[PDB]
Amino acid sequence: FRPGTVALREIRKYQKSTELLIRKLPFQRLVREIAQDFKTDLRFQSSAVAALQEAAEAYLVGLFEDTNLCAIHAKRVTIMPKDIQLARRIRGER
Amino acid sequence: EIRKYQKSTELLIRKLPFQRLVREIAQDFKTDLRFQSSAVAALQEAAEAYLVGLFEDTNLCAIHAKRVTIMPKDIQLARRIRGER
Amino acid sequence: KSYQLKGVKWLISLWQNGLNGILADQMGLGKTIQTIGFLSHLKGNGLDGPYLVIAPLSTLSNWFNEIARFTPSINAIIYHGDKNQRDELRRKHMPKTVGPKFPIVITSYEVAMNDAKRILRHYPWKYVVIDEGHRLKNHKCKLLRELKHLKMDNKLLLTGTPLQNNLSELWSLLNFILPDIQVVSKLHGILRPFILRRMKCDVELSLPRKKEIIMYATMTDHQKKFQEHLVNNTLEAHLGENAIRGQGWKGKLNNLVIQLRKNCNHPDLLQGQIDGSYLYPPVEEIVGQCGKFRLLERLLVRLFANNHKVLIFSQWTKLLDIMDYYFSEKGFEVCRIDGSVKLDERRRQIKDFSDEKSSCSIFLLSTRAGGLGINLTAADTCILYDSDWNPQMDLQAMDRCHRIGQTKPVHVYRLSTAQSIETRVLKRAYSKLKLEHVVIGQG
Amino acid sequence: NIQGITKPAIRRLARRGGVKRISGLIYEETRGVLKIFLENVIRDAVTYTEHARRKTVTAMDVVYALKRQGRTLYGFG
Amino acid sequence: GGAKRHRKVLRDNIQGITKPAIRRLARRGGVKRISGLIYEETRGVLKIFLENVIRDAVTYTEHARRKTVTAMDVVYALKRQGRTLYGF
Amino acid sequence: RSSKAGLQFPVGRIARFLKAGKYAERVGAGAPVYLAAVLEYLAAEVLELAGNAARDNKKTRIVPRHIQLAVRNDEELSKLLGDVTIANGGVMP
Amino acid sequence: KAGLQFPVGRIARFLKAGKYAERVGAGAPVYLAAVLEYLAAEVLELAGNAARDNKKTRIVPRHIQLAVRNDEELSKLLGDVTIANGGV
Amino acid sequence: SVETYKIYIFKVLKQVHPDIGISSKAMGIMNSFINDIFEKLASESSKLARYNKKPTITSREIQTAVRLVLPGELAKHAVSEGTKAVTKFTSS
Amino acid sequence: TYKIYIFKVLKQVHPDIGISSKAMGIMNSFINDIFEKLASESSKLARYNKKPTITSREIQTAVRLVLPGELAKHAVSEGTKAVTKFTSS
DNA sequence: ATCTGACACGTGCCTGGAGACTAGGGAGTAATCCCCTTGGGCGGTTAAACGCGGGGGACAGCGCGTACGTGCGTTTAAGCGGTGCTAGAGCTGTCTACGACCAATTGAGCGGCCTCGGCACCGGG
DNA sequence: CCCGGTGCCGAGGCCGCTCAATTGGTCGTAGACAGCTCTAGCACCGCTTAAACGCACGTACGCGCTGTCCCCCGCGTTTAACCGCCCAAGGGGATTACTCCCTAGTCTCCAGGCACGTGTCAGAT
Ligand SMILES: Nc1ncnc2c1ncn2[C@@H]1O[C@H](COP(=O)(O)OP(=O)(O)O)[C@@H](O)[C@H]1O
């Protein structure tokens, strides 16, 4: 096809689905690594990591919508790092 | 003029206009009501602070689009990614 | 083949009373003819019936080839793979109509388990035959749950090692073979009717005998220091004092047994895992820092005095790696096949190791790997650098080199360390061999 | 009474924030965003007041409302 | 061949979030084209979020004398941060 | 008591919770009734909107995807769940 | 009482009043006093230091604001404070 | 062993939409939404009690707490549903 | 209220400075607000664990869950020292 | 140099400190048993890595014109000061009608057990 | 994009039983409310002067248009790692239900601090 038409295909299917992205095993490795720092030998139930993953994905999707707004404000379509850095500054996040 | 008001701690709106607005917008919630002369002061301090922040984020939003003149699109982009409305 | 004729006499009998049997003839008799001989014997009355035979993959090639060779013709088909299995499903023959061409159905444990739905529809299966009974030694295994959905009017189990771990594996199987099902004699009353284990006794003196000897080693000072720091704690500090490349590391929640077994194997495993140690112990002498390593080295120098090729086994793959590092520094040429290496890659390595001219005498070889049916005979000596916690793995590994084609007499060197969990494990594996040895008494 | 927030004042506030040059349609927008804010805080204040059987918006009513909305206000009471 | 000094190192756990997965999360947010320096930026903002939540969960746990972070410890951390999760 | 009023939610169970939740020393008699009557109203609204959602997708049962959608659609119920993240609920086009 | 300047007794009383819970331990009043004291000390230090820059011999609302704004921790605890009679 | 409003959330549904099923993991959200709205209101009304220095959470308090949590027109129609009920309970 | 103590803390840290009247107000407000936050958190923590006592442990978790960052890591040390001195003596 | 603040001080009355009970939740222990590490086996199979065009979009430069800032002279109307008036905030004292509590009573709703219709996955279209 | 037809499994169903919600007297206390004092909020006047307003004028910035070239996307092919199911044995770790003792609230007396009322003083306004 012509570049950009299969991309609008993907922004429709995924907005309609409710199936989670991010493989389950890598996220669970990351959380644990981030944890050993706080309490040595802390164990996570499975439901906990599940919840954490759900929340994270939502956070990132929201950030991604506001970083698209910011980019459009500058008369572009490509979202660049500056946009994220602008979005977070307006939301207060560290 | 940027430098001057960045060193001062004085009030920037006049007094009585702020009083009237606050009395009217109350009227549409409960008829007849009084207001201690300290309440209208708190309400002014807070409002003035709020507007300064909005303006500081709108300036950021304009520097993004490579301008230096502020425009109504900016206030709106600020207030939307703030969550205000 | 008199025994195998008594092997077909007893499965024609089982067919008669209706009961259900677990032929347990020893490994080496063939383990292949007996099974197809019974399938071909059912030609009387009609071989044209539902028939199913689940087994690993390699078993399948051999089975098919034999059905082709010992007997002239038996509609046979290997239902291996997925999606490509859908076409041969119908190309084979009619759906349920069992003509004299309804081809024998040969599947694998995955296929059987993953898509039982397809085969669930078929008629009460005349005889489902499961090659390796040990697969079902757990009564909560998902294969067992999916294996009950099949409507089976008869069952059969092939094995050579009925019990390995304890009696509960005998219990779970007995539910499978017979749902209905001093004291030693009382057990032999229940089991005499079904079990038919013909030892390697009718055929004996087949190969030169072997010697299995345990040569202990004395835990060195440094390992003792590590062990005491593990019996209490601080082994995550005596190695974490440097605090570089990885800080606030996890606790060795490792069951004491296996964190102290890892020590008794080689302390580097802990040190590497603890500190950054971007580089291996380059001392190439610190590797000496393990007593069991030093006893291996001297043994090997005395066994190069003759050059007869050795075999090395281990439980993990980090430890074989340390060994390889050590020897490769000195310069020895090594070949290695663990589970990480690929299949066709490992098959050519053997084809080269099997090359007598080539001087890659050393051969690193993990324990649980190798599947079944490899042919390693160019070597003569096996060194079990670790223990098992299940002696039937040790017997298999020893037999892999103790198989046909070994003219030179074989030794076995089960290394170990005194005053530690290695000696504990040896006692455990010994009592498991004894659990199976008194069972061999029944016959 | 919202035209009493006159053009020079908005400009002064804007130079506190950092703005450099003001457009000309910026004023009506400012006058709207002030009104919304003032309308929320005052509603909450009048609620708190009535709850105490009074007729006088008073000390700690406004402060409490402003806190309620993420804006702690020290002093003024 | 026996590796020399080099042992058997492994890839970091953050690099586990593959570029394909960031793209999929972006397209669900409505984005059209994505730059290339975006990926190394998303990773940091994920890390910060997670670090604030896990810290609160590990606190709420210890107070119960326990050593396992349940799902109710996570739900409380999120509620302290403004995000409320229904369904656990 | 639930019966004396037209409420369908349980007045007694709410009263007990309020009294046993250390919310205050002495709960009155009307407080359990009022709370029940507000909670019932709120639920009815959400459920009524979610139900209108499903028929559209041509299904006769509600799933989290429906409640999310309904909430996102309406303004007031959104100002209320301004941060809530329903599980397995997707996002609005 | 025994160790600090703040009124361990009064803090305890305030905990008894307000009905924060049924029973208050013995250490609970003591700990809170110390934390509040530390927090006040930090703020009073930066402000005076702020006043040591302006050279003003008297701490005024402006200094407190400036100090809170600068330091990276207090700016986080004190997120949106609007000190009365202060400025940016 | 686990108290829940599931029984009552399915009675209101029937009353509003007569012929529609509910499904599971779907009333796992509706129950949570009720528990949370209860909590908020009660806590507000306690703070509203401790503030007004009274030891009793009465109806007046629950009402001023509703007016401050439930946002917008919901309030009005909730307040009504609720008051209606208190007068009704009164003449029993 | 806390005037004397805030006047005392100042004399110790900056021996020669004074403080205006509006400043004292801000300071007292700050102290009171921290107090309230800390205590409310502690009460909630208690309730979630079905406990009728607000012990020290809850004063510490509360300080960790609300004081942001290293600012807390110190406050915890300061409080532990003072409860230890009081208990031993 | 002075006036808007800023600094002593007092009484007293009101609240912290101390001494003690009966109470009574919390620290201690034993138990059962069930989900949770760490290191390896084999077989699936779908997602992720890589390489290569090619085209679209980011970016820089240039030019016109229009809307913003500055300046100066009118004209509002805010700020201050002072006077008068009364609504209503704040507090006190009486007296009950309302909530806690206990006990007797028992039907509503709750854990585990039925079944069958609607709704996901396909190949076929 | 329709279309059957498929199963085929969870959405409704029922059912004793336990405990939790009613209903009735005392039971005391928490509530309303009636009345009085006096603060402070509102209305209005007159005068000064500072901030707002209107209009003219110049020019800096915003926006459209153009051209170059970087780098992102889509596709095909090869890689890889998530995902499943299995070892054995450890051995732990939570939840529940077990039990005794030392501290909470409770009194009760009695100490001596902090709150509203006053004199000083000194800065920076
Ligand atoms: N002890 C024995 N006596 C006689 N024949 C034997 C014996 N052991 C094995 N065999 C031979 O084994 C053959 C069947 O096994 P086959 O499938 O050919 O090979 P494998 O033994 O490798 O499985 C028979 O033809 C039989 O002659």
Tab-separated table of C-alpha atoms (C1' of nucleotides) in Angstrom, chain J residues 19-108:
chain	number	residue	atom	x	y	z
J	19	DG	C1'	-0.482	7.775	91.676
J	20	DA	C1'	-2.924	4.016	91.371
J	21	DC	C1'	-6.658	0.069	90.172
J	22	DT	C1'	-9.212	-3.612	88.035
J	23	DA	C1'	-9.520	-4.906	83.472
J	24	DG	C1'	-8.223	-6.812	78.223
J	25	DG	C1'	-5.838	-6.144	74.158
J	26	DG	C1'	-1.475	-7.623	72.424
J	27	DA	C1'	2.993	-10.541	72.419
J	28	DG	C1'	3.882	-15.624	72.350
J	29	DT	C1'	3.208	-20.037	70.682
J	30	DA	C1'	1.741	-24.160	68.101
J	31	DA	C1'	-0.298	-25.954	63.725
J	32	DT	C1'	-1.680	-27.160	58.881
J	33	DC	C1'	-0.907	-26.812	54.693
J	34	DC	C1'	-0.393	-24.599	50.371
J	35	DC	C1'	1.473	-21.300	47.118
J	36	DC	C1'	6.046	-19.742	46.312
J	37	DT	C1'	11.690	-19.764	44.833
J	38	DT	C1'	16.423	-21.879	41.616
J	39	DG	C1'	18.317	-24.330	38.956
J	40	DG	C1'	17.796	-27.658	34.330
J	41	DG	C1'	14.766	-30.896	30.670
J	42	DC	C1'	11.503	-30.744	25.294
J	43	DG	C1'	8.227	-28.941	21.833
J	44	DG	C1'	5.261	-24.915	19.994
J	45	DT	C1'	4.753	-21.054	17.347
J	46	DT	C1'	4.029	-16.459	17.117
J	47	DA	C1'	6.261	-12.148	17.885
J	48	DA	C1'	10.498	-9.643	17.252
J	49	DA	C1'	15.078	-8.336	14.535
J	50	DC	C1'	17.064	-7.142	10.454
J	51	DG	C1'	17.705	-4.984	5.638
J	52	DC	C1'	16.188	-2.451	1.951
J	53	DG	C1'	14.179	0.929	-0.783
J	54	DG	C1'	11.286	5.096	-1.468
J	55	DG	C1'	8.551	8.678	-0.501
J	56	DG	C1'	6.663	11.971	2.711
J	57	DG	C1'	7.340	15.259	5.995
J	58	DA	C1'	10.603	18.228	9.000
J	59	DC	C1'	13.199	22.179	8.560
J	60	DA	C1'	15.313	26.525	6.859
J	61	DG	C1'	14.972	30.718	4.209
J	62	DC	C1'	12.421	34.678	2.365
J	63	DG	C1'	8.893	38.240	1.828
J	64	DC	C1'	4.668	40.944	2.782
J	65	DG	C1'	1.292	43.071	5.676
J	66	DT	C1'	-1.146	43.639	9.859
J	67	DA	C1'	-1.711	43.844	14.543
J	68	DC	C1'	0.901	44.850	18.666
J	69	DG	C1'	3.528	48.212	21.752
J	70	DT	C1'	4.627	53.009	22.956
J	71	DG	C1'	3.392	57.935	23.797
J	72	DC	C1'	0.411	61.793	25.110
J	73	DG	C1'	-3.632	64.172	26.471
J	74	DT	C1'	-8.707	63.508	28.552
J	75	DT	C1'	-11.794	61.376	31.802
J	76	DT	C1'	-13.203	58.115	34.869
J	77	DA	C1'	-13.805	56.229	39.560
J	78	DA	C1'	-11.067	53.869	43.078
J	79	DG	C1'	-9.309	54.901	47.570
J	80	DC	C1'	-9.749	57.349	52.075
J	81	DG	C1'	-11.976	59.567	55.851
J	82	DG	C1'	-15.781	59.961	58.295
J	83	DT	C1'	-21.108	59.079	60.118
J	84	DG	C1'	-24.956	56.345	60.998
J	85	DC	C1'	-27.691	52.016	61.684
J	86	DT	C1'	-29.036	47.341	62.646
J	87	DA	C1'	-28.598	42.375	61.178
J	88	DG	C1'	-26.950	38.695	63.072
J	89	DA	C1'	-22.772	36.152	65.197
J	90	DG	C1'	-21.810	34.242	69.842
J	91	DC	C1'	-23.003	32.730	74.171
J	92	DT	C1'	-26.101	31.040	78.188
J	93	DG	C1'	-29.813	28.003	80.484
J	94	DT	C1'	-33.744	24.736	80.359
J	95	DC	C1'	-35.589	20.329	79.277
J	96	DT	C1'	-36.853	17.081	77.648
J	97	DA	C1'	-37.637	13.588	72.843
J	98	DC	C1'	-33.999	10.875	70.780
J	99	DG	C1'	-30.134	7.317	70.438
J	100	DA	C1'	-27.601	3.481	73.019
J	101	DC	C1'	-28.239	-1.001	75.124
J	102	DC	C1'	-29.983	-5.391	76.183
J	103	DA	C1'	-32.724	-9.499	75.175
J	104	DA	C1'	-35.943	-12.272	72.988
J	105	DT	C1'	-37.145	-13.809	67.861
J	106	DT	C1'	-36.527	-15.725	63.327
J	107	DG	C1'	-36.826	-14.999	58.319
J	108	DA	C1'	-33.623	-13.040	54.860
